[model samples]
Target: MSVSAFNRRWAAVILEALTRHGVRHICIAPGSRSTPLTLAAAENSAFIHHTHFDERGLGHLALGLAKVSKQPVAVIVTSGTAVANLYPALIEAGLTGEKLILLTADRPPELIDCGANQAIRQPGMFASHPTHSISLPRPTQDIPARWLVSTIDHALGTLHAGGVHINCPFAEPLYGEMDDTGLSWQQRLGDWWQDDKPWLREAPRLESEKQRDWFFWRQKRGVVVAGRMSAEEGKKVALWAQTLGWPLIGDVLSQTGQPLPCADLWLGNAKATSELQQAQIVVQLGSSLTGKRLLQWQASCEPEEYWIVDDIEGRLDPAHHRGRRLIANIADWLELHPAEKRQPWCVEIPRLAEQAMQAVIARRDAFGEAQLAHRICDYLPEQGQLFVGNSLVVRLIDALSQLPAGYPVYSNRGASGIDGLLSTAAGVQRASGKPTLAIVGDLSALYDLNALALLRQVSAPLVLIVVNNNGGQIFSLLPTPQSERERFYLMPQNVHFEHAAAMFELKYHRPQNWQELETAFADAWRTPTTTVIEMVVNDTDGAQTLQQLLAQVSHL
Candidate 1:
């Protein structure tokens, strides 16, 4: 068989197997070594392929797409450093349980250690980063076509979590003319070619048989903390809290949980903390709360019993609280141990939170980062997604009383780095085809300024709310001296993104106050084009305002 026909035949078989295993999108970075896979993905009508020059950005783009689509996304890259570029995003996928299929093209084993250009030991390169890793031999007539299909089937079927890395090696004559050999290979596939279902299907894992005294557990004065979890699970957590009459402190990313309004602010307050300190137990569903104050309070209280319920395998209780870690899905656990109605102790927490929101409303005229956080929530479309940046931005959003209910929220809390904020949002927009709003800080926006190029490809309305406070504004809230803080931590770039918006052909707005923000946001909501709205504020003032709000909560 011709080398061209061999490569093409294998590529088709692999891609078809992937498609049958539920791979819908493929992100491609152009290179000669990966030519067969790239071409195969492009030629297939079943897969939607997105292209990028930078492999780092490409990895994140695929991450965002898979994160929202709730399906695996394949990423194709050439050998050497291009494969290495995918490590950061792959690490994120591993931590967050997002599915990414890495199809890296490499040189055959013989060429690897001979100092061959653009060739490195590609197999096992990910180093426990991917959930599954397989090295496929260079395509040839001797390698049965069924083996290739079955390998993909097994890899995808066993992919209960994270990413899968499949390294492919190709020899010379990477591209060539087709031959009759493909027809014979097709015959060998038989019913697999026509069958719509996967060759092997994996059953979902069930929780272990461990029963606890839930009747006694439910009687304690406990608080429910909802962190980074699926909306459905968060909803169950909220229902549990409501039924048990426990205060529900929900992180902003916990979309389904009805968090106490301004919980962050009140938690920091002495009065609220004093009241909350009375709880004997803490029932936390999910992990990685955005607010540090709550974690600190819990650590200080050292409750008699702390139960952390989550399906993800990890030590969620970071502070060494010696809590009981329940390794079960929230929905499944709720089914086993149902909540019973009880009298209210923390029911009035929401009313106190409403008072804090009124205080925020009174200070709404103050032009600062904190005020913009609340206003952005108000302006966010009922159906759109809100992707928040880490640091002060997420903390600010968590301080808010309420956000639009139907709209979901997302953040890169798995790894929790400021990198790829814009690219992730772009990927979400690409996958969802909905009006997406990304709220980022100046430093975060500056980290991946090139990601602004992605905004050009967005067909749906994408409003990028870049809050420019001139530096690392979150550092202002830290326990550092003002002079030392400015000297070491701050990278005060008085740069504006209007030129960036114009370069990318996005509608730009620099809203000075709440009034301008209202009009500009309303206009952005109405347009299908991407809009860049920059909110300029003084971080010093914003920090002072937050302290005042905290003080007010403390006094109240």
Candidate 2:
């Protein structure tokens, strides 16, 4: 078989396998070496194809797509450094467990290590960053087509987190006749040619009763902690918590409506700490908790029982607490455990949480980073979905922002680096087709600054709340030495986004005060295109005001 025809054949088989395995989003970065997969992606109609000039940006974009859909998202990029760009997103997904599929087109094996132009040891390029990795040989009729699909299906079958890294090697004549001319030999494709299923379907793993006695925590003085869970999962957990009479403290990602309103803010108070420490049992659902005080308070106390219930099978206990970890689906586990009434314990913490809310209301009448984080969620339109960036903004929102009930919240909290935040949010908007609102930091925005063009391409209304606090203002919260803080820590960049937005053809707005914020942000809500809401603040103002807010919450 001619190399070109063979390349097309492999690409078709792989893409078909991916689609059968339920991959719908395909992120592509243009390059000559990747012609086979890119052309195959375009030829197939199964994908919601996404493209960005920067592979890193598109990788983050695919992360958002997979994060929201909870399905394997595929990425196609050229070989060499293009494959390296996906590391951040890859590791992020590694931690958070987003099912991503990265398909990198590589040079033929002979070209590798022979000083080839666009090849650099592409086989183990990503190391072990991806959850599943496959180094494919150059297209050859000797390898059965069945083997290709079998390997792909099995790799995708085992994929639960990070991504399946399929490095495809294609020989020259990258673009040849793509028409489905009959193969040289009959493929014996069987039902795969006509059916919509993976070649080798994996049986769902049925573990034998690991956390079977998980219901045992109900009778104890349990504190139900809801971290990163869907709104539906959260509501179910909330009902269970209510039924058990256990006070529930939900992370902002879990939607703040069901949990005690100001639980994080309240956790700072010694009284609240004393109250929460009384928990004889701690039953937490999901992981990636954002509240330091809540985690800190829980870390100090040695509970009678610690129950962590989440779908993912891994150690979610970063505190290294001894406990029964229930690796089960949230809904399935909740369904299994019938509600058993138990008397409420440490109910006074809700009152402490109330004081925290009151403290926020009292102190947040002014305009600043703390004030914006505290107030912005309230201003979101009914249809808005949120994507929070890393650093102080996410922390502040986790502490202050009340994620509206039922509105989807997205973030790259897995490897919570400050890169690709803008593009990630843009991916969320494109995937959900909702009016998306994203709050990212200046350094983060600058880091993913190239993604502004990607953001400009979103089909739905998108509002990026770029809180330009000069640079890395989140460093102020840390105990860095004051002398080196500005240069070494903060790394202030005296730049703004008004012109950046102009460059991307996105409408830019810098609201001077609270009234302007409401108006500017509201105006953005009406726009069809991506709007950049640049809220410029003093470098120290965000951290300074955050401390002040915390102090006020403590006073309460």
Candidate 3:
């Protein structure tokens, strides 16, 4: 086999493998080292080949595609940490355990230490991924073509197994142009063997004595703990929970499909409420417990039967040291656990949650941090999704009534930060394909204004409903001098988001009264290209709202 022979063979085999493996999104950042692969994928259009010159942006683009598609999308980069520029998304991908394929172009290890222009130790770049990583040997004519195919097969296998693959390819020495006419033997070399569909292959369901004990546990308390399932699954769980009069602690990651009139929004920090120990059986279903706050609260107190429902096999509570793991779907477990008539505590919990919601609503006009934030969530569109920025906004969302049934909600409490206030919500907007909304204080929004740069890339309309209570409203609730806290701590900003929206070509509105807020929210609900509605409220009033919320939950 000749040098050109290996390039033709590897490129053909890899492209076929990508197609066969169901890689729908391919983000290719422009560069020279990616010649063979790019050229091969150029004319053949089985998958989308999104092109970008900026390597960093290309990585985000790939993450965006993977987030929406829920598949291992490929992001190709030139050799070196041009690949390294992708580190942020790569780390985020690892954190979410996103199935991402990192297709890296590289110079062989021989060229690495020689100070070659785009060469670096690019092998095993993402080894820290939760899943396995593989670095392929350089393709060469002397190497058996079948070995290259085997390597590609193994790379695909690693991908199915979860995580990323750094496909390091080294081409032969450049010797003029190739004979364009003939399809050589090198191209045909990797053409052998069957494609393995690991996902399709059925295996015996894992059932052990411990697993049998899981069903026995379900027999006692039957509550469906659901999170971030398809809207369909969420609906089933909500109805099941409602039918059984079991408390529905909804995160809306799955089924906030229809608002359960009595569903309780569990934010974990339920204000030191005594009801924490009330449940005989606690079923947790969701990608997260969120901030691990709820789990932390329950650290000293243990539930009798704790069930974690998920599609995957592993434990959601990775701190297996803490609780027992019940690896089963929430719906299946609920079916197994016979529903009891009416649980008195379940009825009282929902009633208390609603009463709290009513109390908050009745006091909205009184002027406070909590009321302003609560009003935003309460008044927003029924179909809207809220991304609560950290500090006061996040706390307020949790403290308030759970979003009206059917409205989806999110808070980046997973390694939560105020960073990307608009960016993360933009992510939810992009993911849900629905009109997304966010509530942020002026300071938090100011800190993440650069998130606006990516606003144009979003396909779904996003309404950034800002509760501009001067500065960080949470500070007002904290112990601080009235005069100093208003200035340094609260840091009141005269910077109106209306002007900011004008600069970004986004719609902007300011609502002062309740009617105006209703109109602004209605308009925002209708038009979604990053709408900003600034609601001015008194942070001084927030202190009272916080104290009141604390007092109310303390009773439950």
Candidate 4:
């Protein structure tokens, strides 16, 4: 086979492997080295391709696709720092277990470390960030086509893991005449080419746990914790909690109907927690919990039995509790072992939680970060999908916001960085293709300012709320004093986003209070384009509000 044919053949084979595993969305960063992939991916009409100039945003875009679709996504980018730009997104995938297939193009090995332009050690550069990886050789018929596909089968064999890196180092002659007919790989591919399956099929995963001693765990006073899970799955979990007569502590991401409003605030009440402190067991339904007090309670309690059940294949517990880390689907497990409450337990939790939420609610007459987060989810349309930002906003959301049922929620809670909120939200909106509501802090917005360019492409209803507290006030949540906190920790910026919104050609609004914010939302929903509603408040307001809310709850 010709070298050009081999190049086309190899790229096609990789895409075939990914498509077999249900990767239909391709996020591309244009580049010469990635021409083979870009052309091949574009030619396939079955794949919905997304294009972005920034590789970082591109990576995050794929991340959002994976997050919503619950499937592995394809990302193709050129060599050099383009691949490096994907580091942050991949780091997030590593923690969150979002399936991603990174098809990064590169120059041949001869050019590496020998002063080759736009070349660095692409192989293993991400180290342990990628759960699975394979570095491909320069395209050659000599290497045999089956190896490439077979290697891909192994790399992508296990699904729902983090990003898998397929570093393809292409030789020169980047562009060549396209053969009218497909490159002849029939002899190598055999029926594989003709048939509609992968080169090598993977075996089915283990049966999702047949029988469990959950009946015994059922007899005890257990607390059911719903972490970051789909609203659908969280509802089933809420049902299971109801059947078990356990108090439900659902994270904002869970969005379950079960209501223990402000566990993050309520758990802080030493006297109020006297009932929760009597917990005999703890069982968490998912991972990436936003509740700080919940995790702290888990650490301190060291319950008689703790079970952290999640589908992801890794340890979820931070305190290393001797718990059952069942690597099985949360839904499957719940189905197999149906629970019915032996007796009412932790029933006082809901009452105490309501009291705590009411204490925080009492101070919400004035508009601030606390009021905004407490009320933000209430303004969302039923069709709306929410994306919460990191730093303080996520915590506020975790503490205060209770999402409407089945309204999907998205976030970067894995690595929990403030870098790609906008880009990730852009991806989420594109994937969900629904009216989206994204709340982010000022620093996160500024960090991903270029991502506003991505938002400009949003023709759908996307209300991006930039909650600008005048730079980073998350540090104020800590016990640190003022002088050093203001200078070094806060990193306060004095910039507003109206000009940034104007530069990106998105509709802009500055809402100082609750009424205006709601009005801004109403107006934004009326418009089809993306709108930036900036709520600039006192930087220290949210932090102080939380402290005040907690101080009052303590007396109860």
lDDT of each: 0.81, 0.81, 0.59, 0.82
The TM-score between candidate 3 and the true structure equals 0.75
In candidate 1, stretches whose alpha carbon ends up further than 4 angstroms from where it belongs are: 204-212, 256-259, 347-352, 404-406, 481-484
101-157 per-residue lDDT for model 3 (tens digits) = 777778866787887777777766666753556677777545655565556556655
Q: List the residue pairs that clash in candidate 2.
A: none
Residue 2 displacement (Å), model 2? 1.9
Q: What TM-score do all the candidates reach, one by one?
A: 0.93, 0.96, 0.75, 0.96
lDDT of 4 at 79: 95
Give every collision pair in model 1.
none
lDDT of 1: 0.81
RMSD of 3: 5.3
List, residue by residue over 1-556, the lDDT tens digit for candidate 1.
6776677677878888889878898999989988778877888888888888888889889999988888999999998899998988898888877799999999887798997899898889989889999899877767777777778888888776689999999876777666776668767878887888776565367354454788887888888888777767767777888899888888887764355777767777666777777787888877877876677776777777888887666678877776688878778888887888997686446667778888888887677887777666667765778888887888777775466433578788888878888888889889988888898999899887888887788867888989888888778877777778876887788899999988888899998767787788788888677899998887676666777887787567
Candidate 1, position 481, lDDT: 78
